[PDB]
Each structure stands twice: as structure tokens, then as C-alpha cells.
Amino acid sequence: MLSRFLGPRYRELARNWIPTASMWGAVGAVGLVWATDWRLILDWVPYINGKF
Amino acid sequence: ELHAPSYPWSHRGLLSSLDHTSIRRGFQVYKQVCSSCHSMDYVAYRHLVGVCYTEEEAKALAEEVEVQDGPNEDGEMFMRPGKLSDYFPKPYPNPEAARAANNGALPPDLSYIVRARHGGEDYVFSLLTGYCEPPTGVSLREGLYFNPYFPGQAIAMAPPIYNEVLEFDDGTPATMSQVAKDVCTFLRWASEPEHDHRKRMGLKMLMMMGLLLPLVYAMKRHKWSVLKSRKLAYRPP
Amino acid sequence: GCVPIANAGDFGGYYCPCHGSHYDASGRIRKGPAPLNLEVPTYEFTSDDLVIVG
Amino acid sequence: REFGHLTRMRHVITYSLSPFEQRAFPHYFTKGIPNVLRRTRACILRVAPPFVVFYLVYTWGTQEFEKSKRKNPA
Amino acid sequence: LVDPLTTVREQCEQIEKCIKARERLELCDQRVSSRSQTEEDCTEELFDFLHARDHCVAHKLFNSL
Amino acid sequence: TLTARLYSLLFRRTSTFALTIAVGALFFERAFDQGADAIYEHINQGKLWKHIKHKY
Amino acid sequence: WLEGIRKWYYNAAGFNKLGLMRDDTIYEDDDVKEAIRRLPENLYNDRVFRIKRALDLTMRQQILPKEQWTKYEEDKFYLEPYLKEVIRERKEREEWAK
Amino acid sequence: MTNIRKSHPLMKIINNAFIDLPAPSNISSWWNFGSLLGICLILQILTGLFLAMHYTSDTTTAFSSVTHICRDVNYGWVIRYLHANGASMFFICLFIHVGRGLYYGSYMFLETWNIGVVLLFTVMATAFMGYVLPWGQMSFWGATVITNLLSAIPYIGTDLVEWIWGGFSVDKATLTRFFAFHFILPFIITALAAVHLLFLHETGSNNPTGISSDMDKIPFHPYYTIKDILGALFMMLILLILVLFSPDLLGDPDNYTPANPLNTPPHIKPEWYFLFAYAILRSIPNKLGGVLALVASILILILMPMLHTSKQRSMMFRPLSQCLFWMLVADLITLTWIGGQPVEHPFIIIGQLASILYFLIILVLMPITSIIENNLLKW
Ligand code: HEM
Ligand code: HEM
């Protein structure tokens, strides 16, 4: 809940898992841009903007 | 807006049915009044038989009209006498022709007209008998007509039916109110052909529901009789 | 519905004869049985000689 | 979760009877009607008022809409 | 050939709902006719005059048919 | 006690019970159809294409 | 004062009619089932008999007769000490976890 | 030798499902609706199959095919009206089931509650989609409005309405894809219902009291089969009353008219079981906020397990909560009535106020009332 997650060791777990979850987020964002062929992002990246 | 009254139709009863003689008279009204401008394509002369006409009368009625259908050996659309297979004739070849013919307005399909307007027959009847003179302060463009019941207070249809507008086959007077009643009940039959059957559908079920409900419930209570009479006692040491 | 005939309807622009609704020439309606103005589509005016409607 | 180890219970004595030896409708109206009135009295004060306020607001909305459609002498 | 509807309507004219409705309609008639250009169209009290008359009629007419 | 002999002769065996249901279904459909239909045209006498076809 | 409102609410609650003490009506979450397991034998047996009788009554939809209803002053919070102990132990474990 | 009932795999599953499954004795009629829903599912699916056997999904034949079913097909009108009023009765039973779940704290079965919310979503989608199939004026126009509501979604939203429509607007492609999805979805509903029953059967049903009924459990087959039979019979009584005496009662007459995209109907309204959330949509001025409120009006059911704070699971012993629940029910009735009415004075203000009161009761009044409830009982 609110207080039971508000502990020192819980923020320690949060700090430990920030990198993996944060770059899982990057994995998801890159996968979404890839799957949708998002021209807003894919235009800037090199060697792929040629597909447009 | 002004909606329709609640006329005591002969078929408005919970287990009542339409008067089929009036169905036949209303169909005559449809033939010789509005069949020249209105279409009822969803119904056919086959539906007529057994509820308002016999087989021979239906055959004669069908052959009284001419329907153009089929490509011949040369491919031309040939006209032949209508038969029981054919649906009701469409007065205008294509809808745009109908609009251009009358005033640009389209006569709605009379097949589902009663089941489509909020109020049912009581609406349409009220319209047909509701042809009034425009009130003070309301102008009328030459070609339109004033009807309080029609949304917009201005209908694009000339007064269809009036006194002696027809001659019923039976011999009942062709006065305007009677014609309106007959045509409205015929349109109710056309919109909901199953009406009579539905009523006969319901009555049996109702009597059936007067027999299954008191039984099954009893059976349930019978099967509950063990629990509802169950008695308990606490005997701690 | 129907189709408003042009060059009619007192104001001048359009006239729907079904129930006598006159329309403003610019595309609106000044008054009449019709509730609101005539719909305007997402047309484009590029190359006036060849104007495309979306 | 099935019959045989649902829970633990002791010193409980229960009786019942065959459905073929007792009436299926034991005084269905002698105590049924008083029971219905008792339950109705128990639940009426907490059930009705939310529906009655809806009745009033429905009537007021309908009448006010009709009045608004009427012309307002101008 | 006279109509059942016209005589039923005439008999339904002389009931007090339709009497007040007719008075209100006549007042609007004189008001709108007197005033040169007014959007005030006597449609609404005409509608109440109807709503009284057609209901009175519908209660009786179908027996005459 | 008619019910006692009825049960002892045609209800105890489930096979004869099912025969009773199946056979009585015939005649219940018969009688119920006829009674309900008769009630139906009694309420609507003269308005169906069964009491006026002789006219045409 | 508030005790009148409390008594009115106890009368209007309903479980007094069914011959249930207050602790018979509490939702059975993890703490509650652990506390129920922690109950002594006699209290647990009376509790289960009371609950079974109440379920019978609401199955038949017959409220228990007037005279032997659970009075306000006769209502004993038997579960309360065990539930308090269970909650305290759980809170201590959670504090240790944090 | 062992019982075929509880040794054969299929028969063992059926036995543990609804033959020898322990059930609370004091289960009232409010639970019967569950089985009714299943019945109202099957009675739907079968009928749908027959309708699909005389329906030609196309803008040139949809209305004509439905008319042909109604008139010409032997006993086709009965199937058609059976289908329509069965969908209406399905939604009646669904709403009553949700009300029961709210009232007696049945949302403490979190997994079953969430699966039920998913089922409810799927049922609304199926009914909205199916109402398009007759291709009447109301069908097409309402479909245009509801699908165009997705244009309010930022960025992708506009493209989505082009994707769902299969083009620039609701046309034949939309009709046929709606037909296909309307065919497939009820079987997904059946699978989700099986999962929902599995989750519930793991823990067992909840009695009206809210106390665990493990001490008093009765076998399902001898009792809770014939009771459900009686419930289904009563449901059939109501449903055939609707079909056989007032067929087009709840349905708008404007459907019995060919879908003409050249004429907007006088009032565009969805079904009576859709008017409450559509009125919620109407209440919020912002377009995107309207869709958010519309989806939240049903998604709020998932929050209910978290918002419970009273120590008693059910509501039999919480009269204040009972009054709040009935206020909520009256508010939903007001939402439906407002959705039926046009957005004019005073319907605008009434709809807005009732829309606020809906969320205010669910999120605020119920938990605060539960806190006062616990405080009033020494705990
Ligand atoms: C989840 C259960 C179902 C619901 C709630 C549902 C809902 C609806 C609704 C509301 C309609 C419109 C009725 C009307 O015209 O007024 C409809 C039509 C239709 N449904 Fe379903 N349906 C269900 C199951 C099915 C299934 C399983 C099929 C396919 C086998 C099916 C096939 C059809 C067809 C063909 C139509 C068009 C015919 C018609 O509109 O009457 N339905 N459905
Ligand atoms: C597809 C329609 C549905 C079917 C076929 C279905 C089926 C069932 C059945 C048969 C039961 C047992 C009887 C009962 O408790 O009523 C049940 C219980 C339950 N259902 Fe559903 N259900 C459906 C929709 C829903 C919905 C929309 C919800 C709410 C989100 C829901 C939540 C529950 C809950 C909480 C229970 C347990 C009630 C209790 O134990 O007292 N179900 N379901």
C-alpha cells in the first residue's frame, strides 16, 4: 500500500531496479517506433530515413 | 410538436387482431389512391392470399397490372402480366424520378411506414384526417400543404383521400374517415404481417405460463422442503 | 435531405423545394424549416485551375 | 474446495424431513404475507426515497422542458 | 355524403377545453393580423386546440365507423 | 385414493413414467392447441380470414 | 450524546436480529482467518453455531424472535483481542521489512 | 469400481462445476441471474446462428435481408425479435448481476471481478456492433457518432476512425467487418465466462450475509439446478412477453427505415442500456474528456475492491451504505433518462449534476460512509 511501500529497503530496491526497468522502457519505445514505422522518430536516425 | 391521439383500434387489444375485411378495403385504397405515387416493394401479392384475398382473386389482381421484367432472346426488357410471384408495382422507376415528379420530395416506402414513425397507425391516421388550413401568421409556399402532425408543420403531399374518393368492392361508404381507417389498418397489416400470429403466439404461451410457473415453483419448494423445515440444536459439553 | 436548387430562395442562393427551405447564398441559411446551415467539406484551393475536394 | 474437508464444526445437531412426508407449501399465506410486510417495512425506508427523488426530478425536468418549448409575450 | 368525422369533430368543438382553446386562438389571430410584421404564427395554441379536439374525437369516433 | 393406484401402476418405474410423459404429450398438445385456438377466435370472432372467407 | 446514535445504529444494523454478535459479521481477510484459527475451542464452536443459524435464518428469510436478540450491552467483542494481536504482529513484521 | 460422475474427466469437471459443488444455502434470487446470463448467452448464440443463416451483410441487401427474415422466412420474425429482446434481457441481467456484486461485497473475489469487467466490456462492444447489422437509419447514424467519438483521441485518434470505418466513413466495409466481429466475439465471451466460473469455483460463492458459509454448504445438483430452472423460466416468461406482445418496445422505430446518409434523424440515440454512459459522454464539454469519462464510467468497477474500507464485506448490516447504493441506482436511472432526452435545458444541468454525483458516490461517499460505519460500531 502507501506506508508499507514507504521504507528504506524499498527505495533501495527501487534504486537497484531503476536501470533495468528504465531501459526496458527504452526497449519498449524502440519496439513501438519500429513496429509502427514512426516517421517522426525514424526520419532523424541515419540509414533508415532512406526507406521514406 | 403535436403527437397523435390514442384511437381505440380493433387490433390494439392485448390479444386482439386486425379486421381482415378492413385489411382488404384498405388495400383497395392503397391500389386506387396512393399506388400511383407510393411504393410498397417489400410486400408481394403472395402475402395478400390467405389474409385478405383468395388465390383466384389474388391471381386476377396480379394480372390486372403489367410488370416489365426479364431479358428476351433479343435482350429487351419485355412487359408481361403480373403474377403472384411479383412484388407490388413501384409507381416510379427510380427514386430521383419520383422526387423530380412530385416536388423534389420522396414518398416514403409504405411497407415499414407504420413501424417507423413514433405513434404507429394513430400517427398516420391523424395525419390523413389532420389536413388543416394554415393558421394566422404562417405563410404557405404554393405547392406545400399544412398538417399539424407532420414534423415541420408543412407536408409536400396534396390531400390524398376525401369523401367518395373511391368505391369499395363491398359497398361500405367511401367517406374520408372510413377510408383513412381502412388504409391505416391495411398499412399496419403490411408493416407487421405476423401480428395476428403473434397474438395467437402469445395467448398459448400465456396459458402455458399459467401452468408451468405454479408447477416448477412448487417442485422447487418441494425440493427445498428438506432445507426449509430443517431444525438445528446446539449441544456443547 | 433532397437537393437544393440554385439561384432561388428569396435571398438568392439556394432553395430546397421539399418543404420550402430557402438558404443563404454564401452557404448558410438565413431562416426556414431547415435547422442549420449547409455542410462545407474539407476542400482545398490549390492550383485554382484544378481545385481538389478532399 | 469440495465436500469432505470444508471446515471444522462440533456439537451441532441438525434434523430435517423427507420431501414426500411434509407439505410443500406450509401455510404459504398464513405467515407468508406477514413476512412480506415485515421485510417490506424493514427495507422501504432505505429503498424508496432515492426512487421518489428520481420521480420528482423526472417530472420537474419534463414539465420544465415543455414550458421551455412554449413561447415567452415578446 | 357527409362524414362521421366532421360531425364528431363539430360535437367535440363544444367542450370547455376546446372553448378556451378557441378563445386563445382567436386572440392570437387578431393579435397577429393586427400587427404588420411579427414572428409571433399562431401554431402553438392551435396545437393545444387540436390536442383537445383530436383526443375528444378519438374517444368517440371509432364507434361511428 | 386414485393417486395411489396411479403411482403404483404407472409412476414407480421410470420407463413407464417416460411412457406416460411421451403419450400424454400427444393429447396435451392436441387439447391445448384446440382450446387455446378456440379461445383465440372467440375473442376475435369475425375478424379473421376463417369466419369471412365464405363471403368471398 | 453519541451512544444513543450508536444504539440506534445497532438496532438498525440487522445482525442483532439474526442472533449474531458483532465479530460474527466481520469480513474474513488474512488477519481475520488467522485470528479465527487462533480462537479457543469453546468460542470457535459458539461462533460457528451462531453463523450457521444465521445462514439458516436468512435462507428461510425468518428473523429470529424478538426476545432473544443480542442486546447492545450483552454484545461481547470476543475476536477483538486476537485480531489486535494479529494486526500488531503483522505491523511489526512490516516495520522489520522496511 | 469408481463413479463415472467423478472419475471420467469431462464428467469429473461437470460434477465439480455444478453437480457436487458446495454452495451457500442462503443464496437469494440475486445470484440466479448469473445462470440466467449463461442461459441468455446460449439462447442468444443459437438464435444468432439462425439469423446469420439469412443475413447478407451489404449496404444493398442488409435491410432487405432483415426484412426477408421478418416476413418470408418460416418463423423468422420470432427469431429476429427473440434476438433483439434477448440482447435487451441480457443487459438487464448483466446490470442486475453487477448491482448484486456491488451490494454484497462480491468484488472481494478480485480475479472473478476483473474477468467480469472484461466480459461486460466485451458484451457492450458486441451489442454496439450488432445494432449496426440491420443497417437502419438509427443503426448507421448512431454508428457514425459513436465511432467518430474516437476522433477526439489525440494524435493517432483520427487515423483510428479511418481504420475502424474501413475508409472515409461508415460504409459497406464497416458493415461486413462489424458482422464478422459480431460473429466471433460471443465465443470469446463464452471462453471468458468459463474462466470467470473457474475463478469463482476456486473460492466459492458469497452468501448475502458476507460471512463465510463453509460450515453450511449444500450440494449444487439437488437444489441449485431446479432453482436456476425456475429463474430461467421466469426470464423466459418476461422475454417472450416482450417478443410476443410488444416486439418493438425498447427499439427505436427509426431503425425500420433504410439507412440514408443524406438525412440526419431527429434525435440520434443508442439503446436504453447505452444511454447512461452516452449521457455521461454528453455531460463533459471537452471531447477527449468525454471519452475518458465514458470509459471510466465502466472501468470504475475495477477500483471497487480497493475502495472498500468497511469491516463488513456485504451491505445487509450497513444501512447507510444501502441508502448510498440506492442513491447510485437512482442516479443511473436518471442518467439513462437524460441520455434518452435531447441535450437542452434543463436536461443539460440535470445530466451534468447526475454525472458528477455518480463518481462522487462511488469514489467519495461510499468510503467515507464506510469509515463512519466502522466508527459507529466500536471498530
Ligand atoms: C453476446 C450475445 C449477442 C448479443 C448481445 C447480440 C446483440 C445483437 C443485437 C443487439 C443485434 C441487433 C438486433 C436488432 O436488429 O435490433 C444483433 C443482430 C445480429 N446478431 Fe447478434 N448478438 C449476440 C450473439 C450473436 C451471435 C453469436 C451471432 C452469430 C451466430 C449473432 C448474429 C447476429 C446477426 C446476423 C444479426 C443481424 C440480424 C438482426 O439484426 O436482427 N449474434 N445482435
Ligand atoms: C457474461 C456474463 C456473465 C456470466 C455468464 C457470468 C457468470 C457468473 C455466474 C454463473 C456466477 C455465479 C452465480 C452468481 O453469483 O450470480 C457468477 C458470479 C459472479 N460474477 Fe459473474 N457473470 C457474468 C458477468 C459478470 C460481470 C459483468 C461481473 C462484474 C464485473 C461479474 C462478477 C461476478 C461476481 C463478483 C460473482 C460472484 C458473486 C458471488 O459470489 O456472490 N460477472 N458469474
DSSP per-residue codes, B69-117: EEE-TT--EEEEE--TTSBPPPSSSSHHHHHHHHTS--PPPSSSHHHHS
Q: Under the phi-then-psi rule, with left for phi > 0, alpha for psi from -120 to 50, and beta for the rest, what region is B115?
A: alpha
Which atom of ligand 1 sits closest to the CA of residue H45? 27
Phi, psi of H312 (to 5 degrees): -100, 130
Chain centroid to Cα H328, Å, comes to 17
Q: Which 8-state DSSP code applies to residue B32?
A: I
Torsion over CA: B4, B5, B6, B7 (sign): negative
Contact H307, H363 (CB under 8 A): yes
**Does the distance separating the beta carbons of H244 and B198 come in below 8 Å?**
yes
Number of residue pairs across B and F with CB atoms under 8 Å? 42
CB contacts of G97 in chain A (<8 Å) are: 4, 7, 9
Contact B89, B103 (CB under 8 A): no
**Does the distance separating the beta carbons of C20 and B154 come in below 8 Å?**
yes
Catalytic (active site) residue H205: yes
One DSSP character per residue, F1-56 reads -HHHHHHHHHTSSHHHHHHHHHHHHHHHHHHHHHHHHHHHHHHTTTSSTTTSTTT-
Contact B132, B2 (CB under 8 A): no
Contact H2, H199 (CB under 8 A): no
**Does the distance separating the beta carbons of D38 and G52 come in below 8 Å?**
no
Question: Secondary structure of chain H in the HEC alphabet?
Answer: CCCCCCCCHHHHHHHHHHCCCEEECCCCHHHHHHHHHHHHHHHHHHHHHHHHCCCCCCCCCHHHHHHHHHHCCCCHHHHHHHHHHHHHHHHHHHHHHHHHHHHCCHHHCHHHHHHHHHHHHHHHHHHHHHCCCCCEHHHHHHHHHHHHHHHHCCCCHHHHHHHHHCCCCCCHHHHHHHHHHHHHHHHHHHHHHHHHHHHHHHHCCCCCCCCCCCCCEEEHHHHHCHHHHHHHHHHHHHHHHHHHHCCCCCCCHHHCCECCCCCCCCCCCCCCCCHHHHHHHHHCCCHHHHHHHHHHHHHHHHHHHHHCCCCCCCCCCCHHHHHHHHHHHHHHHHHHHHHHCCCCCCHHHHHHHHHHHHHHHHHHHHHHHHHHHHHCCCC
CA distance G9 to chain B (A): 29
Q: Whose alpha carbon is nearest atom 1 of ligand 1?
A: H186
CB contacts of E51 in chain D (<8 Å) are: none
Torsion over CA: H160, H165, H170, H174 (sign): negative
**How many other CB atoms are there within 10 angstroms of residue G52's CB atom?**
21
Asked if D10 has any chain G CB less than 8 Å from its own CB, the reply is yes
Rounded to the nearest angstrom, the distance between the alpha carbon of G9 and the centre of ligand 1 is 49
Grid coordinates representing H233 are 423460466
CB contacts of E46 in chain B (<8 Å) are: 135, 148
Cα–Cα distance for residue pair C27/C22, rounded to 1 Å: 11
Grid coordinates representing H171 are 460504409
**How many other CB atoms are there within 10 angstroms of residue H134's CB atom?**
23
Grid coordinates representing B95 are 427514386
* Contacts of residue D30, Cβ cutoff 8 Å, sequence gap at least 6: none
Q: From which experimental method does this structure derive?
A: cryo-EM
Q: Pick from E15, B73, A40: which is nearest to H155 by CA?
A: A40
Q: Pick from H97, H68, H98: which is nearest to H80 by CA?
A: H68
Cα–Cα distance for residue pair B82/B63, rounded to 1 Å: 5
Cα–Cα distance for residue pair B33/B27, rounded to 1 Å: 10
The B-side interface with H (CB below 8 A) comprises: 14, 42-43, 47, 108-109, 111-112, 115-118, 151, 191-194, 198, 201-202, 205, 209, 212-213, 216-217, 219-220, 223-224, 227
- Cα distances from E10 to residues B2, B123, D61, in angstroms, run 20, 21, 36
- Considering only CB atoms, B117 lies closest to which of H67, H245, H253, namely H253
Cα–Cα distance for residue pair H186/H86, rounded to 1 Å: 14
Cα–Cα distance for residue pair H67/B41, rounded to 1 Å: 11
Element (H, E) at B199: helix B195-228
Nearest ligand, CA of residue H54? 1
- Cα distances from G28 to residues G31, H212, H300, in angstroms, run 8, 7, 24
User: What residues does B233 pair with on adjacent strands?
Assistant: D13
- Annotated catalytic residue, options H213, H228, H321, H370: H228
Question: Active-site residue numbers of C?
Answer: 19
Substitution target in A1, A2, A4, A6 with the highest count of G β-carbons within 10 Å is: A4
The type of residue at H342 is P
Grid coordinates representing E40 are 409571433
Contact B18, B196 (CB under 8 A): yes
- Considering only CB atoms, B151 lies closest to which of H230, H248, H266, namely H266
Cα–Cα distance for residue pair H231/E61, rounded to 1 Å: 45
- Cα distances from H297 to residues B186, D39, H128, H330, H358, in angstroms, run 46, 33, 16, 15, 9
Phi, psi of G86 (to 5 degrees): -65, -45
The type of residue at H149 is L
Cα–Cα distance for residue pair B196/B16, rounded to 1 Å: 8
Contact D19, H223 (CB under 8 A): no
Question: Chain D window 44-73: which residues touch E at a Cβ cutoff of 8 Å?
Answer: 70-71
Contact H259, H136 (CB under 8 A): yes
Rounded to the nearest angstrom, the distance between the alpha carbon of H277 and the centre of ligand 2 is 21
End-to-end Cα, chain D, rounded Å: 76
Nearest-Cα residue of chain B relative to residue G54: B232
Contact C22, C14 (CB under 8 A): yes
Cα–Cα distance for residue pair H235/H230, rounded to 1 Å: 9
Grid coordinates representing H376 are 459507529
User: What residues does B155 pair with on adjacent strands?
Assistant: B145
Q: Pick from H370, H324, H372: which is nearest to G2 by CA?
A: H372
Contact B185, B179 (CB under 8 A): no
Rg (CA), chain A: 18
**Does the distance separating the beta carbons of D57 and H334 come in below 8 Å?**
yes
Is the bond into H346 cis (omega within 30 degrees of 0)?
A: yes
Cα–Cα distance for residue pair H243/H257, rounded to 1 Å: 20
C43 in a labelled binding site: no
Element (H, E) at G47: helix G41-60
Contact H182, H44 (CB under 8 A): no
Element (H, E) at B231: strand B231-234
Nearest-Cα residue of chain A relative to residue G90: A4
Cα–Cα distance for residue pair B209/H189, rounded to 1 Å: 31
Q: Which long-range contacts (CB under 8 A, 24 or more apart) does H255-258 make?
A: H255/B116, H255/H134, H255/H136, H255/H137, H255/H138, H255/H139, H256/B112, H256/B115, H256/B116, H256/B191, H256/H136, H257/B108, H257/B112, H257/B116, H257/H136, H257/H137, H258/B109, H258/H63, H258/H135, H258/H136, H258/H137
Question: Quick one: resolution in A?
Answer: 3.6
Classified as helix, coil or strand, B68 is: strand
The type of residue at G82 is Y
User: What residues does B49 pair with on adjacent strands?
Assistant: B53
The type of residue at E39 is E
Classified as helix, coil or strand, A6 is: coil
Cα–Cα distance for residue pair B185/B194, rounded to 1 Å: 14
Cα–Cα distance for residue pair H312/H374, rounded to 1 Å: 9
CB contacts of H229 in chain B (<8 Å) are: 216, 220
Cα–Cα distance for residue pair A38/A40, rounded to 1 Å: 5
Question: Chain C window 26-45: which residues touch B at a Cβ cutoff of 8 Å?
Answer: 33
> In degrees, to the nearest 5, what angle opens at C-alpha B66 toward C-alphas B65 and B72?
155
Q: Pick from G9, G34, G37, G13: which is nearest to G25 by CA?
A: G13
* Contacts of residue B105, Cβ cutoff 8 Å, sequence gap at least 6: B99, B156, B157, C2, C17, C18, C19
Q: Pick from H367, F52, G26, H314: which is nearest to G34 by CA?
A: G26
Contact H347, D61 (CB under 8 A): yes
**How many other CB atoms are there within 10 angstroms of residue B99's CB atom?**
20
CB contacts of A14 in chain G (<8 Å) are: none
Classified as helix, coil or strand, E23 is: helix
Nearest ligand, CA of residue H24? 2
Q: Indicate if ligand 2 lies below 6 Å from the C-beta of H38.
A: yes
Grid coordinates representing D22 are 411434509
Q: Which stretches of C1-54 are assigned E, i.e. beta strand?
A: 5-6, 14-16, 21-23
Cα–Cα distance for residue pair H363/H357, rounded to 1 Å: 10
Classified as helix, coil or strand, C2 is: coil
Instruction: Name the pairing type of β-strands D12-15 and C21-23.
Output: unpaired
Q: Which 8-state DSSP code applies to residue D24?
A: S
**Residue recorded with cell 517522426:** A40
Cα–Cα distance for residue pair B169/B28, rounded to 1 Å: 8
Cα–Cα distance for residue pair H69/H51, rounded to 1 Å: 8
Nearest ligand, CA of residue H274? 1
**Does the distance separating the beta carbons of B236 and G56 come in below 8 Å?**
no
CA dihedral B151, B152, B158, B160 (to 10 degrees): 10
Q: Under the phi-then-psi rule, with left for phi > 0, alpha for psi from -120 to 50, and beta for the rest, what region is B11?
A: alpha
Phi, psi of B24 (to 5 degrees): -65, -45
Phi, psi of H23 (to 5 degrees): -135, 150
